[PDB]
Amino acid sequence: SNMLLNYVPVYVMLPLGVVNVDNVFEDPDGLKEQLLQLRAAGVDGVMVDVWWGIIELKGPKQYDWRAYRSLFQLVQECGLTLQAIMSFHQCGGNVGDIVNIPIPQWVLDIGESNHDIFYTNRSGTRNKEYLTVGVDNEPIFHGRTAIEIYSDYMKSFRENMSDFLESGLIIDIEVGLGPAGELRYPSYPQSQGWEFPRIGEFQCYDKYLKADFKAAVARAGHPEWELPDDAGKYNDVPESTGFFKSNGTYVTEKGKFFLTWYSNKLLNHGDQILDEANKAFLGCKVKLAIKVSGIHWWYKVENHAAELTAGYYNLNDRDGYRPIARMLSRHHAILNFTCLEMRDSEQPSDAKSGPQELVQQVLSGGWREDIRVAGENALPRYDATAYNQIILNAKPQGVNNNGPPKLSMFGVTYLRLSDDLLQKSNFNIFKKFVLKMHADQDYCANPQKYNHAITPLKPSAPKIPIEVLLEATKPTLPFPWLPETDMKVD
Ligand SMILES: OC[C@H]1O[C@H](O[C@H]2[C@H](O)[C@@H](O)[C@@H](O[C@H]3[C@H](O)[C@@H](O)[C@@H](O[C@H]4[C@H](O)[C@@H](O)[C@H](O)O[C@@H]4CO)O[C@@H]3CO)O[C@@H]2CO)[C@H](O)[C@@H](O)[C@@H]1O
């Protein structure tokens, strides 16, 4: 078999706010010159937020798809494909967020009077960037539940963009499932202080989550159990907490029970919404995808504090990612792992960071459950170092000169298309990165040639029970990585 079978596509994220809060496509001409640059570089496609808070701004079911229609048209004129994010979250409080885009005002209005629709920490701070899982199924939004809102939105998108869907412009629909569009709790909000190598806080204090928790413990036989109260604050270190120190609460029954409850709320949140997405896009030539954050800090300590916290119940003896991957399998979805570039040695020692290990764990789990795996770089990088790291992760065992590689990622979405990137020296490097992702081949317009043809979305396979999902917590050894890519940028 051909080298082309080694190709991994590359996408570029568009700038935040290319459609402003006013639902206006501000600078088509500018963008256009940029896109044309990417097309000549050999880039396969681009990724864009489809902000819920811009589209359904006016009131319920008052969608205005016009400015996005224009943008998609321009992308299509430029010969690029497109990855569309159903962004049901706010833009603004996270790293890199240069523009503020909130959720719909009319939703915000409701929260003015029912504060418990937001994620809440133990101190009672309400985070407005995303609606809490606790209201997925509460019909308090003018008669709709939150899941109905998301679902209606995706249906509308589907019907209103059907021409672009059928012309094959859109290749994947990333379903936003939490803050920054990631399936996670907002445990590390910059907007509340949080600073890097801090552990973050559990976000289950809104009333619906607290009531669910309380009923559940009571059924377990411990009505008396409460939500954690010894876990510290955003910027603690684990050892400084009752919850996470050795022999702390996290390894008690109560803690295990809690952690399981907490992490399972995510799994079910993701499963239910993907169900809705599957039905909305049924028949379309697209794949669905979700985003999983890379919480590499504290990875190297037994407690994995930041991971727990974000709702990833990952320990050294409990795989907290593989169950997500298994969940994705019934929906035929892709796991988009949002941190691919970092090296362990670039982290402060005191953060006990294990980014490379975390990567191998996550991709291996996906590959093992037989799903497709994609990823992004978490932070803006322009150096060969970062690029060669992404290339290694893309094809962990190198290129197969006589067939398809044994392990390969399904795609990688580079972080942001800025002025800096297009600078002459930066862009020259990038061009190389693109070439080596492409395995030394020229850009290949027909994906069928590299074994990526998209077939019409089928219906989801049947619900897998939580027990079965949870079997995937059994630790496995990762697949073997090369120490260095065989296809470096230098
Ligand atoms: O336009 C698409 C979306 O883009 C933005 O969200 C993306 C994040 O910016 C990107 O970093 C990533 O998400 C998480 C990373 O996996 C995780 O490592 C972390 O980044 C850390 C970093 O590891 C650490 O060293 C540094 O010092 O602190 C950072 C922590 O904040 O958190 C990231 C976010 O949870 O992928 C996201 C989605 O593509 C926009 O904010 C989002 O609104 C857009 O939808």
UniProtKB/Swiss-Prot annotation:
InterPro entries for this protein: Glyco_hydro_14, Glyco_hydro_14_CS, Glyco_hydro_14B_pln, Glycoside_hydrolase_SF
Pfam families: Glyco_hydro_14
Superkingdom in the source lineage: Eukaryota
A single MF term (Gene Ontology): beta-amylase activity
Active site (catalytic residues): E182, E376
Residues the record lists as binding substrate: D49, H89, D97, K291, H296, T338, N377, A378, R416
Keywords for this protein: Acetylation, Carbohydrate metabolism, Glycosidase, Hydrolase, Polysaccharide degradation
EC number: 3.2.1.2
Annotated phenotype, changing D97 to N/E: Loss of activity
Record annotation: effect of changing E182 to Q/D: Loss of activity
Keyword Signal in record: no
Catalysed reactions, semicolon-separated: Hydrolysis of (1->4)-alpha-D-glucosidic linkages in polysaccharides so as to remove successive maltose units from the non-reducing ends of the chains
GO biological process, any: polysaccharide catabolic process
Position of the signal peptide: none
PANTHER family recorded: BETA-AMYLASE 1, CHLOROPLASTIC, BETA-AMYLASE 6
Subunit text: Monomer.
Assigned protein family: Belongs to the glycosyl hydrolase 14 family.
Name under which the protein is recorded: Beta-amylase
Gene symbol of the encoding locus: BMY1
